[model samples]
Target: VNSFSGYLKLTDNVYIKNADIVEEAKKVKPTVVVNAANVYLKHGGGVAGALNKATNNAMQVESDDYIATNGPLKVGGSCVLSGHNLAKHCLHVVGPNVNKGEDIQLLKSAYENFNQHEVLLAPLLSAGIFGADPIHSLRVCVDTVRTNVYLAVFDKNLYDKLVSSFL
Candidate 1:
């Protein structure tokens, strides 16, 4: 695992950081943690899978419950699930299963519905198995923030790219 941390200022309050997502979630103790997922609400792979493990697999249980009531989630939508580990809430967002633009729209829409005063923690959406470009996806995520935001990057290469692009 990479021990490096890099910070980028998006605004006076909003910023992005390259670090371990699990560690960042613990350090921040954020009100909400965002995870990329499919409509099936599978928390078994990518950042979502890692988060599930970090949270002691609570995400999968909660996601299963949520889906039972809500049905299969839409591609461009989100569900606010309960958090079990460091986070107070879990924001499950559908990633770019189709096109990047629509996926980004969905992510921005999810952010718009976020509660005020929330310390949000998120990975670079669709940058892993969902297959969006990390650099471009980072820009989309940064632009979607209305309040303070924390971007958690787990990949060393992606972290270096973000640091080089901003710092």
Candidate 2:
């Protein structure tokens, strides 16, 4: 690992990299990006919105088509789909909304499912509008990641928080 880039290791296959998941997903080849989608897979707020924007709004259309074909993705469930002009694949996951006794379990399930990939890109799922603490999101990803991952962190304080807590 380089001293610069703040890209550190969590384990053999898992990594903690500070980069925007949307932009980074485009750089890496054959990577599957995990979107912090809602239960309806709507791309309005949260990572889904921006990710959809970066993909030229194609992700949103795909999400709509997916729901039309397969039905709304349940909380904690995920589905593999196209990343459009971004990553090779996209894993749409519905994290918890901090609305019930179902937060942690759903978050864990979102991360645990569809984890079979060579390179995976993930955001801090359910950390913002969904009302989950950032640390909780980090731990869930750390705990359940079963393949190569680049967990993106953009903010300085949160990056340091995760780095310290990770170490």
Candidate 3:
């Protein structure tokens, strides 16, 4: 007897792409663009965090026109706080107290590149003391942009909007 897993085929084979940057890039016509919603570092959603946990590592590798940023370049000196993980091979953008403006900066960065393959959007301010958290940022991102974008994050909060047609 054949064992069926709920619906489809009994035996399926997994296809893996060869790990060749130049060769791989040539095979696929670049049509999609992406941006990090927020920086992933130290605590789960920072740049470093994603680098460590993300399985889809190709998103940020040798990405051009892509930059990582947040609030002021240096709240006095460094952009990262105590215990925050640092991102290598990335340019950080500081926030200018523009509230929703941060999200816009990220979008603009992605647009500037226009189909540069993959851009890993980290978690935006979904939670914090100020209203400029990820929740509000998500609202702005969803309301403003109109495109067929792909986002990679562990958080399911964005699932609805990312898949929503209105967005």
Candidate 4:
């Protein structure tokens, strides 16, 4: 029922929205989204937190249950769980931790988990508490994901920069 303003096109397949992902995801189609995740799949903060709350903690519970049963996911690994409220499924991909000295290939590995035809509402995977620079995350994201990626950007400055340059 809605589309965002201030969209930044990064490639034929990647784009960004200066919008809250949790809110927007509820009504969107194609019904798949990505969680910029830790190997632990805690969903404690950043976009992970927002999406967790939006889905009434169902995603969190699923992740927790997964880890308890299957062990911690490795960096660069991924899993999918039910999107109890917002969409049909949520992809939890463990991206790089820049402070952990794992970048590029690890970050690219996260995007590589996507199914090529899935229209994904993806986040800047390594840019939050993991501390990878946004440009670095953005670059890897665009270069890596083969599916249609809708980036849900949360920062004003990044949005302004993208708006000024990317339209």
Top model by TM-score, which number?
2
Error of 4 at 123 (Å): 0.6
Candidate 1 local distance difference test against the native: 0.70
Candidate 3 root-mean-square deviation in Å? 12.9
- Could you say which candidate leads in lDDT? 4
**Candidate 3 deviant stretches above 4 angstroms:** 1-45, 52-131, 156-167
TM-score on alpha carbons, each prediction = 0.81, 0.87, 0.29, 0.87
For candidate 2, write residues 35-127 as lDDT tens digits.
Answer: 888777888976788889887888888888888988887888888898788777888888888855455777888788646675677887777
lDDT of 2 at 116: 67
lDDT winner between 1 and 2, please give it.
2
lDDT of 1 at 83: 68
Which has the higher lDDT value, candidate number 1 or candidate number 4? 4
* Error at 100, model 3, angstroms: 15
Angstrom error at residue 70, model 3: 18
Clashing pairs in 4: none
Report the poorest 10 consecutive residues by lDDT, candidate 3.
9-18
The TM-score-based order of candidates, best leading, equals: 2, 4, 1, 3
* Tens digits of per-residue lDDT for model 4, 11-119: 8878888777887687574377788788889988888899998878888888888999999888988888887787788888888887888855787777788754357
lDDT of 3 by residue, 1-167 (tens): 21111221111211111122112222332232122223332213343334323424433332211224342232111122211122222322222223444343443333223223233122232222212444344444444334322223333454334334221
